[PDB]
From a paper:
The cellular retinoic acid-binding proteins CRABPI and CRABPII act as gatekeepers and facilitators for the passage of all-trans-retinoic acid (and related derivatives) through the cytoplasm to access retinoic acid receptors (RARs) in the nucleus. In this article, crystal structures are presented of the L29C mutant of [name] CRABPI in complex with naturally occurring fatty acids (1.64 Å resolution) and with the synthetic retinoid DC645 (2.41 Å resolution), and of CRABPII in complex with the ligands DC479 (1.80 Å resolution) and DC645 (1.71 Å resolution). The retinoic acid-binding ability of both CRABPI and CRABPII is centred on a hydrophobic pocket created by an orthogonal β-sheet fold and capped with a pair of antiparallel α-helices formed from residues 15–35 partway into the sequence. The pocket contains, at its most buried end, a trio of residues (Arg112, Arg132 and Tyr134 in CRABPI; Arg112, Arg133 and Tyr135 in CRABPII) that are responsible for binding to the carboxylic acid moiety of ATRA, usually in concert with a water molecule that is conserved in all structures with similarly binding ligands.
As part of crystal-screening efforts, we identified that an L29C mutation in [name] CRABPI allowed vastly improved crystallization and diffraction to atomic resolution, which was subsequently determined to be due to partial dimerization at the mutated surface residue. This mutation is found on the outer edge of the cap helices and as such does not affect the make-up of the hydrophobic binding site. The crystal structure resulting from molecular replacement contained unknown density in the ligand-binding sites of both independent monomers that was not suitable for fitting either ATRA or the synthetic ligands used for co-crystallization. CRABPI shares high sequence similarity with other members of the fatty acid-binding protein family and so the incorporation of MYR/TDA molecules is a logical step for a protein produced recombinantly in E. coli in the absence of its natural ligand. Similarly, it has been shown that RXRs and other retinoid-binding proteins treat fatty acids (including myristic acid) as ligands, and so it is possible that nongenomic pathways are similarly influenced. To date, CRABPI had only been crystallized using the proteins from M. musculus and B. taurus.
Residue numbers in the entry:
A (entry chain AAA): 1 to 137
B (entry chain BBB): 2 to 137
Write the structure that this text describes.
Amino acid sequence: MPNFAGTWKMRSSENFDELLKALGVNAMCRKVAVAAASKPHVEIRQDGDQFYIKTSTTVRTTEINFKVGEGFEEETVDGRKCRSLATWENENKIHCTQTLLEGDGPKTYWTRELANDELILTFGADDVVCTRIYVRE
Amino acid sequence: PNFAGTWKMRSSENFDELLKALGVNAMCRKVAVAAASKPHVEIRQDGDQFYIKTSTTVRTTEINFKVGEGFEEETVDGRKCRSLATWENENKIHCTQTLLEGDGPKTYWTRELANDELILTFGADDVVCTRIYVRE
Ligand SMILES: CCCCCCCCCCCCCC(=O)O
Ligand SMILES: CCCCCCCCCCCCC(=O)O
């Protein structure tokens, strides 16, 4: 029912450096990630529950393909392989639960919500929350 | 010796081990080693006065120094340091470093001209990384 599809550009970021610190990312990498990941561009294709999400920066591009309610594999923000499940949390919000394939680490998740035609991306690592707001371009 | 010119890296040794000695975690080392795999360097030199720009797609650094005079730069892992370059021989500059802030391994770099190749060495405690540059 909500239409996530389109091209998006990041307008604002809260607590990204703190999220990377909670994931144990070294400052050498955080310094580049915070500079470069200051202006990601996102493309979404959506057909009902079926999604394609591509996030690109000069430093790193990721693409995921998933159906809401079906398991898939992706990476955490710090690049660790995880098994994921996206659920509708409400009519305008996808909540994605994540479990590491290998090893131990903080509990991670992401959410994507459409609110007043803005795309709110939240990432969790234990009790740390990062909020990135995307707008249409 | 004429360090001036444009240079491209042909080989690297022990960069992963150097970043480990600097306390960089494995996931970060894998990305950093890849990101640093082929820097392009521009040097301008006028006697003892040096300008060194090192560029990669993800990160560019520039330093200006005179041999024998203190300056401030960053370690490889991006920690602010106070530095001093000296001639170790006719074709070799040795740069001693001290952290401005916090504690960490003893670091230094050397740049040497040998058979018109540019040999960059980084030290962190007893670990040595060697990077060899050739003229572009
Ligand atoms: C998220 C990406 C983090 C990337 C951090 C690596 C930064 C580039 C290192 C450049 C080292 C060049 C050393 C040299 O002068 O040969
Ligand atoms: C080991 C290095 C980990 C650092 C991660 C870099 C991430 C850069 C781009 C992330 C984009 C986040 C977003 O979707 O807004």
